[PDB]
Scaffold this active site. Structure first.
Site, PDB file in Angstrom:
ATOM      1  N   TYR A 186       0.780  -1.215   0.398  1.00  0.00           N
ATOM      2  CA  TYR A 186       0.474   0.041  -0.406  1.00  0.00           C
ATOM      3  C   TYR A 186       1.151   1.533  -0.238  1.00  0.00           C
ATOM      4  CZ  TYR A 186       0.739   0.859   4.789  1.00  0.00           C
ATOM      5  OH  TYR A 186       1.039   1.353   6.722  1.00  0.00           O
ATOM      6  N   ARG A 187       2.049   1.772   0.416  1.00  0.00           N
ATOM      7  CA  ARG A 187       2.821   2.493   0.753  1.00  0.00           C
ATOM      8  C   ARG A 187       3.466   3.126  -0.390  1.00  0.00           C
ATOM      9  NH1 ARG A 187       5.581   1.003   6.039  1.00  0.00           N
ATOM     10  NH2 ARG A 187       4.825   2.350   7.672  1.00  0.00           N
TER      11      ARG A 187
END
Ligand code: NA
Length: 181
Positions: free
Chosen positions: A129-130
């Site tokens: 997700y980063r």
């Protein structure tokens, strides 16, 4: 070979415009580096076919940019759909980085991720997700010591593989010029 959960997936897209709900992906390229930014492998460089009605949404900037680069001709000639481009890219990435481990890496990569969520969610799901956004470092450098930026320049051709190569070179430059780790 050098398959590792520390490897980084770099991606760049070219599109017919800025709005994922309206516009389409016309090129995609990926590169895998290790955690130290050494380039391990370059992935498929795919001009994605789009019909004229989608190309006809392009404004002047997109039309002149993607015509002059030769991308529009490649899109018109292409026999690869978005799904096939996803398949090709996933088959490449699975050889180098495990699913869900690499942040998405590039310049202002949030915009690309928006297009992935809308048009290639199976590929978006491969990323952690980063975000590793090289433009975050560019912006902080511009504010804290802008003279550093005169030492690095970009061609900015809007050919997806060349631009992602420039993104990696930009981050390599920052590690020596603005980082101490
Ligand atoms: Na880009």
């Amino acid at each position: 070979m050098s398959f590792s959960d520390q490897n980084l997936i770099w991606i760049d897209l070219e599109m017919t415009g800025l709005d994922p709900e309206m516009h389409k992906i016309i090129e995609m390229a990926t590169i895998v580096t290790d955690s130290e930014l050494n380039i391990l492998a370059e992935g498929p460089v795919i001009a994605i076919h789009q019909p004229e009605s989608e190309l006809a949404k392009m404004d002047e900037w997109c039309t002149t940019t993607h015509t002059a680069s030769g991308l529009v001709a490649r899109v018109r000639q292409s026999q690869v759909s978005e799904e096939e481009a996803i398949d090709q890219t996933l088959a490449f990435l699975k050889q180098w980085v495990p699913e869900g481990k690499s942040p998405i890496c590039g310049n202002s990569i949030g915009q690309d991720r928006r297009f992935l969520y809308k048009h290639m969610p199976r590929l978006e799901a491969y990323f952690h997700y980063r975000y590793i956004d090289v433009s975050t470092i560019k912006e902080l450098t511009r504010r804290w010591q802008p003279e550093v930026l005169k030492e690095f320049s970009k061609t900015g051709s809007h050919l997806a593989l060349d631009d992602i190569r420039e993104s990696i070179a930009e981050l390599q430059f920052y590690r020596k010029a603005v980082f101490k780790i």
